[PDB]
Amino acid sequence: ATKLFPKFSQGLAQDPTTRRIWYGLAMAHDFESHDGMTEENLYQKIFASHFGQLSIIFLWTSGNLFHVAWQGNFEQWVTDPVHIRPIAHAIWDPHFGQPAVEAFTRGGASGPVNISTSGVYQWWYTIGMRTNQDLYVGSVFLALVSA
């Protein structure tokens, strides 16, 4: 047989083993050794890939802003930060039992939240955020930029 996956290497998409699956996952970003790869094509693929990476980065940061702004307590943390702990995000796991959720509910929240050991709260308090609304605005902006 001569299966489709993967199309970048013909000799790889030839053998009737399960080596083709693992190797097709492994040689995907080895642009220099695909079939029919010139040099211009190499540079162009690298360029577009860089754009992909930038999109993922900005989308991720928007995610952090969104979850902090929605499920966190950044509005209450700025009044007294030698006190009430940072909040990263909230949990909804159907596998929990009663003392589990009774335990995880900490930091002043109303459900299973877990503490934010990331330093985003101090960063955003220093640079000049004060409320949730500003964080939401930042998240929307960064999602737009990622798009």
């Binding site: 596998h95 929990f96 039992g97 009663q98 003392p99 589990a100 959720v101 009774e102 335990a103």
Partner: protein, 740 residues
């Protein structure tokens, strides 16, 4: 016609070949040119099939080597008795066995090691022994250090005798082949002579020395006032004072009136309540019956007179419908090959060792053994490990027989042939059962861990939640506890206290208490079964796929020990039977580690402890039934809780363990370089350093070469086992010597 057949002066005695290293083989002889040749000199020293190709010479070699091994054992025993005699506190221990701890080693006052001399009690200083020679010596009747010294001298003399015997039988009177190939005479003489007459002689020694001396010692008189044993041999009336049957002499024996020997040949069951060991009358009766049994068994085979069996006839008569020709052709296999014999004998020998360990904790035979916790733990652990190693050796030499000495022309339709001919079914089903046990036996622990961490402890497998009861073992436990009333009408008690019943306490501590079996026991037992089956899988796969396979059709021609067959056909690293032995070693380590952990924690939680006359307060408070279903339970309650003594031993008389702990870790982590990496990298690095020597004209004229693949693997597993086992040794001894 079985007879003596000996040749005269085959090999002369001169130092000539000691100055010619590697004289034994044709390949090694020409002298070194690389550093591979040194390791080849040491690797093939005992490979007696790789010097010549004749049976007789190999047999003579292995015979004299056996003599050498016996000699070194005698030197070892002599050392032990000597150190007991001169550098110990044995007499102070006999005066008071409790509160005086056994010590038999004294260190020299140098850089500061003199803090290792502990306060063992009795006005003595030294290192506490757990080998338990003191209880053995009290069981034999030894009361003075002079007798120990005499035994030491006797041991040394026997050692010299053994080395001379070896020299004699290789150089002056060396037997022929057909002396060796008379297996039936060897069976008769071993079964009768060695086992039987040894049992009978030791029964004699017990009846005439060990029974009365221990009767007086347990009666309360101090050991010096007790009469010397030759007064017990010579004077009948003292024995008549102790056991009145001796006043009638040996008249009851020869007229079949044996019922009058019920004073020193008994059948009472449990233990000596004042001592903690077995009743010595039972022990003497036991060896008498053993000797009669073996002396009867030793007249089974035909040697020179018409009576008796032939092995070939017995083997060739057993063949059924499902197995073709049956056993026809196993006698020629088992009289012309040494590796087959080594395989069978190592197998049964190691399994025998493990059974020794189990019976030895269950029914403590020596006086004042059960209340010396360290001795119990050390003896069980030691015999466990020796059994494991021997069984893996059985695997290895069965593989070597498969590679070298197997000839299919003499072996056509046969049990061995048919096993080879459906190895695929065998290994496939063994693989299946390994995976089944894996998922269930370990997933139970993962599930209990998850449920116990998610807030719901009601959905985990335990004694109070969903229950898994070992109903079979509990039923067998009750069967044997009830045995003295229906199915053993003449015993007064059960054969041990682990089957149930009352408690035996010697000096405040617990000798043995009944053991209960719950859900944690169920799960750990299936863990044991799982690891045992995996090791069987690896070793049996090595044996069956030693000659050929679907991957390599000519694996026999590459030999027993070879690294690969290139990177081709995908890659064929580790296809020899030798590497199957290698991985088997790793899994043996795993399984036995689990076994001895199970024993240690179960005993510290449910058996040992002090009888404070307020019930029983165990050492760890009895937390096994609640904690041995979570991996967190083991990691916290066992490894993290019980390491407080081995990590804080600095400054006390116990710091050697807390200092050999870390070294054991170091060697364990040092093995990983040899295991993970490969020799090409080291070859290139060694080449660059060779350049750095070529610059300064210090080029070694022998050539530096990296280790071969097989040697790198072997060194890796050596360091791995050494580090792991040394860690466990240090941990166990520090813990139980500290709190036990």
């Amino acid at each position: 016609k079985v007879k003596i057949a000996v040749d005269r002066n085959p090999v002369e005695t001169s130092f000539e070949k000691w100055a010619k290293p590697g004289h034994f083989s044709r390949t090694l002889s020409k002298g070194p040119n690389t550093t591979t040749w040194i390791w080849n000199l040491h690797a093939d020293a005992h490979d007696f099939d790789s010097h010549t190709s004749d049976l007789e010479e190999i047999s003579r070699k292995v015979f004299s080597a056996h003599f050498g091994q016996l000699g070194i054992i005698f030197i070892w025993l002599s050392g032990m008795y000597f150190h007991g005699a001169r550098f110990s506190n044995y007499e102070a221990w006999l005066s008071d066995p409790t509160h005086i701890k056994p010590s038999a080693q004294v260190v020299w006052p140098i850089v500061g090691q003199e803090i290792l001399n502990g306060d063992v009690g009795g006005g003595f200083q030294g290192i506490q022994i757990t080998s338990g020679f003191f209880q053995l010596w009290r069981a034999s009747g030894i009361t003075s250090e002079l007798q120990l010294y005499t035994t030491a001298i006797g041991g040394l003399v026997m050692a010299a005798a053994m080395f001379f015997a070896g020299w004699f039988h290789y150089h002056k009177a060396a037997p022929k082949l057909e002396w060796f190939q008379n297996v039936e005479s060897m069976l008769n003489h071993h079964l009768g002579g060695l086992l039987g007459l040894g049992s009978l002689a030791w029964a004699g020694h017990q009846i005439h020395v060990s029974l009365p001396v221990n009767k007086l010692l347990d009666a309360g008189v101090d050991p010096k006032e007790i009469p010397l044993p030759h007064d017990l041999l010579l004077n009948r009336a003292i024995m008549a004072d102790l056991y009145p049957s001796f006043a009638k002499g040996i008249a009851p024996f020869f007229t079949l009136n044996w019922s009058e020997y019920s004073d020193f040949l008994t059948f009472k069951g449990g233990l000596n309540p004042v001592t903690g060991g077995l009743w010595l009358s039972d022990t003497a009766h036991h060896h008498v019956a053993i000797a009669v049994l073996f002396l009867v068994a030793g007249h089974m085979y035909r040697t020179n007179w018409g009576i008796g069996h032939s092995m070939k006839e017995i083997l060739e008569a057993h063949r059924g419908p499902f197995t073709g020709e049956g056993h026809v052709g196993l006698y020629e296999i088992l009289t012309t090959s040494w590796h087959a014999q080594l395989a069978i004998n190592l197998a049964l020998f190691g399994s025998l060792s493990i059974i020794v360990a189990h019976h030895m904790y269950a029914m403590p035979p020596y006086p004042y053994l059960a209340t010396d916790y360290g001795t119990q733990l050390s003896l069980f652990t030691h015999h466990t490990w020796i059994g494991g190693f021997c069984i893996v050796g059985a695997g290895a030499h069965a593989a070597i027989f498969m590679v070298r000495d197997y000839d299919p022309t003499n072996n056509y339709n046969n049990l061995l042939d048919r096993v080879i001919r459906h190895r695929d079914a065998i290994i496939s089903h063994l693989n299946w059962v390994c995976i089944f046990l894996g998922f269930h036996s370990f997933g139970l622990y993962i599930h209990n861990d998850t449920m116990s961490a998610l807030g719901r402890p009601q959905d985990m497998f335990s004694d109070t939640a969903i229950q898994l009861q070992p109903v079979f073992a509990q039923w067998i436990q009750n069967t044997h506890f009830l045995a003295p009333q229906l199915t053993a009408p003449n015993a007064l008690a059960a054969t041990s206290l682990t089957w149930g019943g009352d408690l035996v306490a010697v000096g405040g501590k617990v000798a043995m208490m009944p053991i209960s079996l719950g859900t944690s026991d169920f799960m750990v037992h299936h863990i044991h079964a799982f690891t045992i089956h995996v090791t069987v899988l690896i070793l049996l796969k090595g044996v069956l796929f030693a000659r050929s396979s679907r991957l390599i059709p000519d694996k026999a021609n590459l030999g027993f020990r070879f690294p690969c067959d290139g990177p081709g056909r995908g890659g064929t690293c580790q296809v020899s039977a030798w590497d199957h032995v290698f991985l088997g070693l790793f899994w043996m380590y795993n399984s036995l580690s689990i076994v001895i952990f199970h024993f240690s924690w179960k005993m510290q939680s449910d058996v040992w402890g002090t009888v404070t006359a307020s019930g029983v307060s165990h050492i760890t408070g009895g937390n096994f039934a609640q904690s041995a279903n979570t991996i967190n339970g083991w990691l916290r309650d066992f490894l993290w809780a019980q390491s407080s003594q081995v990590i804080q031993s600095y400054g006390s008389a116990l710091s050697a363990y807390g200092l050999i702990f870390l070294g054991a870790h170091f060697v364990w982590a040092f093995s990983l370089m040899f295991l993970f990496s490969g020799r090409g990298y080291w070859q290139e690095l060694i080449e660059s350093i060779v350049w750095a020597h070529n610059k300064l004209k210090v080029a070694p004229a022998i050539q530096p070469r990296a280790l071969s693949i097989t040697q790198g693997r072997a060194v890796g597993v050596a360091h791995y086992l050494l580090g792991g086992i040394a860690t466990t040794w240090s941990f166990f001894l520090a813990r139980i010597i500290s709190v036990g």
